[PDB]
Design a binder for these strands. Structure first.
Lengths: 131, 136, 61, 92, 92, 50, 200
RNA sequence: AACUCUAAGCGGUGGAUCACUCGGCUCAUGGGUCGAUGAAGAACGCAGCAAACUGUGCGUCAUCGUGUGAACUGCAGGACACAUGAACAUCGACAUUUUGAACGCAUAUCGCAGUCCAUGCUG
RNA sequence: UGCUUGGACUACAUAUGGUUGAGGGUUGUA
RNA sequence: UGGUAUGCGUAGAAGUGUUUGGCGUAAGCCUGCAUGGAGCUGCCAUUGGUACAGAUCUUGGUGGAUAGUAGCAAAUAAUCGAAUGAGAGCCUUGGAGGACUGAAGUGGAGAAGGGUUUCGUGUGAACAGUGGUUGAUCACGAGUUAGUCGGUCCUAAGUUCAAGGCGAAAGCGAAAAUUUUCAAGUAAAACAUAAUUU
RNA sequence: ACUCCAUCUAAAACUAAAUAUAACCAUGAGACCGAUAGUAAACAAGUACCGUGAGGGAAAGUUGAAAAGAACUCUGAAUAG
RNA sequence: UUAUAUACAACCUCAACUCAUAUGGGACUACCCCCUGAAUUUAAGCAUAUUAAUUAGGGGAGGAAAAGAAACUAACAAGGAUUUUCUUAGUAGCGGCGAGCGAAAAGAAAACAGUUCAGCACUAAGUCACUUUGUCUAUAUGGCAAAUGUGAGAUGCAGUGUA
């Protein structure tokens, strides 16, 4: 961080991510796009939107359980996905907390909003390659 | 005159140097005392100056110069525009009035070397500072 | 809001609008000399400036 | 016998709830607050009582109006409306 | 402004009490008992009851709850039977 | 007292509301420090006094 | 060195005056009033809970020596002289077992290097490889407490490349771990002899 | 035997020690932004479930406008109004109680007037 | 009018403008 | 803390218990074994809030006294005994029965005070220096309706303070109380409007 | 005191910058402390609590990767085992 | 007018307005401008002294404050507002000349910036606040224009111009 506005300080950075207002929480709760989707759109990553199909690259599942996000629970910093649940002693199937920084987005919801953001990501993709 | 110490008639609790009551005198002139009193009642007018007309025994007669900063004549007219600035709010208590400036004792030079360098509080502070340069 | 704008358009063209239409900025700022009445210069200062305005020159080798 | 017995005849409230601060410190007989100088212009905020100022200060309350003044300064106290650069038509 | 009238017929009557003892007083004594605003001067209560629910009010007796709320016991004219009116307000 | 001034009655009335044991479903919150209502003023344990 | 001081008001908040003996409890100052269980409880001592330490750290604590003009320069020149002499350089570490020459001079074309990849290609052939590899592998999480202070740890100061003219040398060089660039004008003693250990 | 002494193993008791920390502390840097246009502070009532913290004022855990674009979440009423918008920020439009400089006069009384405009009832 | 409810007003010091005023202060017309 | 051992490390760090083995005159060190879970150390230089047994030290914890020794003893003080429950001398309670205060009350009301303590229901741990199913406990609900009783109103002792002033101001350990008519005023008109009234 | 010289022009008024900053707002660092420490307060902290009042004013951080916070059966009124 | 004989027009001075229009109070209080103002302590006791023109108290402002174009500093080959820093200086000097206290000038630097009434013959008050209406147009206590309408002002204001 070369510019004077700028916290490297450990305590300050921890304020930011833990106490994150929900819009910063979306950024944090982004997941990288699948290798497929990277060819199509030329987009690294997108911030999880409810119908997104997901494969968990880590723990216990490490490849597959091709399922759709129920809700992004931003205050828990956790994403719950349909079909991915842990057996409780009381037989109650409760969702496994899956961070989106473990995940590939396999399928992207298209809205006019969602496309515009993919397009922003498309346009900046040209620039630093140029540099 | 003499600003007789508000003492309980109990003797002033300490050292004999502090035992004078009635020979103890204002470090502020009677010009300024006239101004400060007017200024609290008339907080909306800003006081430039005070001059004397007459004096017998118990009282001293002053005419005090008051300005309306909220009157657009006095906003209006360029020479006196600067008095409308919020810096001049109650000059009298800060002795930016002529009466107050003299009591605070700010003359260039030597007869006032202490206190001209710093206004009267300020001079003390400079002198009694250990200026510690980093690279000692 | 429809009352508020109704009041604004009536008090528009009219000096000394009701206290709540007056830009509640801060107390100090309101009383702090309108821009016209700060720029005001004595007739003499206009002469001084008129002939001699600080002109953008240079020094040296 | 005025020992515990001195406690036993204590029934007459010397102080009632402050109109200024609710700190229950207003002297009935003198009609004056200890601490908060009860309706005599000044709150008695002593610089010897550093802790007293600490209680009485901004930040112990919600600071309702003055907090909004801070953000408006950065806005340079503008009356108007920003509105919307692009469409954005509300129809069903 | 001018600032709109801050005690409408609505605001005056917040709720009907509906407590077990209150319901008995509808049955027996032909009273409809309401939670009211602490600003409601009895004569507010009469006016509001008359206007909202069509009922001729005979007398109103007012209590303050230890829950910092008012109870208004509204006596109805013998032309109007309570229990029908309570169930017009929809509450058994 | 025994017939309490209206100002007093309002302050005491608010105090009665405080004396309630915390809803037990609030205790189950993520980063919930609240085990109990702990400011429960029981009148012969903690007055209001003075 | 950035000034740390203990709060000057810390342990002086407490109004505590000390109970004279006969009180059957020790001399030290004790917190007045009632029922908080801070009262009264142990105040003001360096030997007390919540009480201020003897010698409380003060911001007037001397950071800097002004070092004699000739003296630091002497150290600097001595450092440059050590930068040749292969035994000294081996002594500090720096895996230089198969290096082209000491004192290692390379073409001025080195300065022009816009890109990090291009830089590494040069350096390795020029015989940096083992010493640059000495860096990156060694990065390790700080043992202290020092980890919280942003003092994440020490990793290997591999090579000091010196340039007369920055034609894009610095930006390319900045990235690569433990590799530092200096100008001939500035020639830092810290960079030439890190830890006072001669033989960069 | 039991007990006591001495040592050791195991279990208690107790919270030292270690390692962590959305906090504290101190130095540096940018800015000047309370108030009779009714402050700071206090009191009071407010969440579907809250009693506080926190937020807010009677439009009460918040409203316009604006930004983003789908949560909140303990349980849920809700979730819908995700494409005109959640929710959080922005917050420039409004609201902003009873007070407090505190302003009709008072205040072990939320007590008691006067005045203008206005409403219902009776006439 | 009676009876009843809501809103807005009614502190003090003080400048200026407004008009009413006032004093064997003092001037003049009669 | 700078440097370094291309140090160690979740395949178990640090910490710590330890009749592991050993080193040093010692300060102290290493290692084993068990526990552990997330980070750590040696060496050379560099700085200190740097090593504890004490200070009638501080703060927290814990013993012997003492699973019980003081005691839990004033107002005699129960008791038969039905019901219930996990348990019941009291406390839960009837019936019964011994008595108590002995209407100058341990009664029946209120102020001053208390602040939900009142009351129903549920009723366990903690509390009732004992038990305790019961309670002023703990949990859950309800309840304090007035033209005529008080507050209100009124004045008292006395006070808050607008004054001419005085004070460093605030304020006056002040009743200052002076302030055009500071005054109360008419269901009243003619010429200072016309009576009175500080 | 006398005799001179030099030097300004009081008893009036306006005026940036360098200069201060333990508060406030917006920020960045530390050979800072690491829960008897550090601010009084890492936490419903100027809180709970005491005192008529002024004031005095704490103790108290940590399950785990995930609550997966021990279903079920049994003994026990039950807490527990 | 003025003996109580009325009426009108002025000036001065003081009242009455819930008058038209405005303003002050209070807080915050790190920094700062003033007023006001100790003692512990040191002197091995103790009073002057010291602590100290400091704590406490109270009023008032700003982003800095205050200060500010010298009734200066000097004695020169003078320099040239103010502020601060470096220096002088632990010194000139003060002081039971005990304890202890003590600055400025020149010299160096940071940053720099200058000025104006009022008092002379403008000599057709050249000036100004307000109230209304034209216009303008902020969301104005605004500017333009008209009434040449009140009022201020020769008991004095414009304006050259400030040693």
């Amino acid at each position: 961080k070369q510019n004077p506005f700028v916290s490297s300080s450990r305590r300050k950075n921890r304020k930011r991510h833990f106490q994150a207002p929900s819009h910063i929480r979306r950024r944090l709760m982004s997941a990288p796009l699948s290798k497929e989707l990277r060819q199509k759109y030329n987009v690294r990553s997108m911030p999880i939107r409810r119908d997104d199909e997901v494969q968990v690259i880590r723990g216990h599942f490490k490849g597959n359980q091709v399922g759709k996000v129920v809700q992004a629970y931003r205050k828990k910093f956790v994403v719950y996905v349909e079909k991915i649940q842990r057996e409780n002693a009381n037989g109650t199937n409760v969702y496994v907390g899956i961070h989106p920084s473990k995940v590939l987005i396999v399928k992207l919801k298209l809205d006019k909003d969602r496309k515009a953001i993919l397009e922003r990501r498309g346009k900046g993709r040209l620039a630093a390659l140029g540099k | 005159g003499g600003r007789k110490r508000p003492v309980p008639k109990g003797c002033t609790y300490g050292k004999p140097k502090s035992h004078g009551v009635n020979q103890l005198k204002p470090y502020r002139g009677l010009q300024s005392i006239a101004e400060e009193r007017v200024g609290r009642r008339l907080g909306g007018l800003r006081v430039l100056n005070s001059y004397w007309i007459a004096q017998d025994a118990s009282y001293k007669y002053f005419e005090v110069i008051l300005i309306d900063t909220h009157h657009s004549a006095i906003r209006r007219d360029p020479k006196i525009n600067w008095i409308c600035k919020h810096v001049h709010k109650h000059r009298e208590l800060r002795g930016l009035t002529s009466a107050g400036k003299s009591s605070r004792g700010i003359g260039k030079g030597y007869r006032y070397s202490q206190t001209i360098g710093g206004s009267r509080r300020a001079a003390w502070k400079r002198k009694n500072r250990e200026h510690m340069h980093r690279k000692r | 809001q429809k009352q508020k704008e109704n009041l604004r358009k009536v008090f528009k063209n009219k000096k000394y609008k009701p206290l709540d239409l007056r830009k509640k900025k801060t107390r100090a700022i309101r009383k702090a000399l309108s821009p016209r009445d700060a720029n005001r210069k004595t007739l003499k200062e206009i002469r001084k400036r008129s002939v001699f305005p600080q002109r953008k020159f240079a020094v040296k080798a | 016998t005025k020992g515990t017995s001195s406690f036993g005849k204590r029934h007459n409230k010397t102080h009632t709830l402050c109109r200024r601060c609710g700190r229950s410190s207003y002297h009935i007989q003198k009609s004056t607050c200890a601490q908060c100088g009860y309706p005599a212009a000044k709150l008695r905020s002593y610089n010897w009582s550093v802790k007293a100022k600490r209680r009485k200060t901004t930040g112990t309350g919600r600071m309702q109006h003055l907090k909004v003044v801070r953000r408006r300064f950065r806005n340079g106290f503008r009356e108007g409306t920003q509105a919307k650069p692009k469409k954005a038509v509300a129809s069903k | 402004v001018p600032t709109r009238n801050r005690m409408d017929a609505y605001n005056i009557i917040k709720y009907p009490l509906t407590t077990e003892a209150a319901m008995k007083k509808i049955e027996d004594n032909n009273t409809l008992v309401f939670l009211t605003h602490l600003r409601a001067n009895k004569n507010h209560v009469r006016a509001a009851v008359r206007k909202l629910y069509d009922i001729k009010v005979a007398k109103v007796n007012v209590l303050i709850r230890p829950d910092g709320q008012k109870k208004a016991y509204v006596r109805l004219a013998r032309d109007y039977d309570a229990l029908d009116i309570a169930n017009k307000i929809g509450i058994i | 007292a025994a017939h309490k001034s209206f100002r007093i009655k309002q302050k005491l009335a608010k105090k009665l509301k405080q004396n309630r044991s915390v809803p037990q479903w609030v205790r189950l919150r993520t980063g919930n420090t609240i085990r109990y209502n702990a400011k429960r003023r029981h009148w012969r344990r903690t007055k209001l006094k003075l | 060195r950035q000034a740390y001081a203990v709060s000057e008001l810390a342990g002086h908040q407490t109004s505590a005056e000390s109970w004279g003996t006969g009180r059957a409890v020790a001399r030290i100052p004790r917190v007045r009033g009632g029922g908080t269980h801070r009262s009264g409880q142990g105040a003001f001592g360096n030997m007390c809970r919540g009480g201020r330490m003897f010698a409380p750290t003060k911001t007037f604590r001397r950071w800097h020596r002004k070092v004699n003009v000739n003296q630091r320069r002497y150290a600097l020149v001595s450092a440059i002289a050590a930068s040749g002499v292969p035994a000294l350089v081996q002594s500090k570490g720096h895996v230089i077992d198969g290096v082209s020459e000491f004192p290692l001079v390379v073409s001025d074309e080195v300065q022009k290097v816009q890109k990090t990849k291009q830089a590494v290609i040069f350096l390795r052939r020029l015989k940096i490889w083992a010493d640059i590899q000495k860096v990156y592998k060694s990065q390790r999480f700080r043992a202290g407490r020092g980890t919280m202070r942003d003092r994440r740890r020490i990793a290997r100061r591999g090579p000091l490349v010196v340039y007369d003219k920055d034609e894009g040398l610095r930006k390319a060089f900045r990235n690569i771990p433990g590799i530092e660039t200096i100008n001939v004008d500035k020639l830092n003693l810290l960079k030439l002899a890190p830890g006072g250990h001669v033989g960069r």
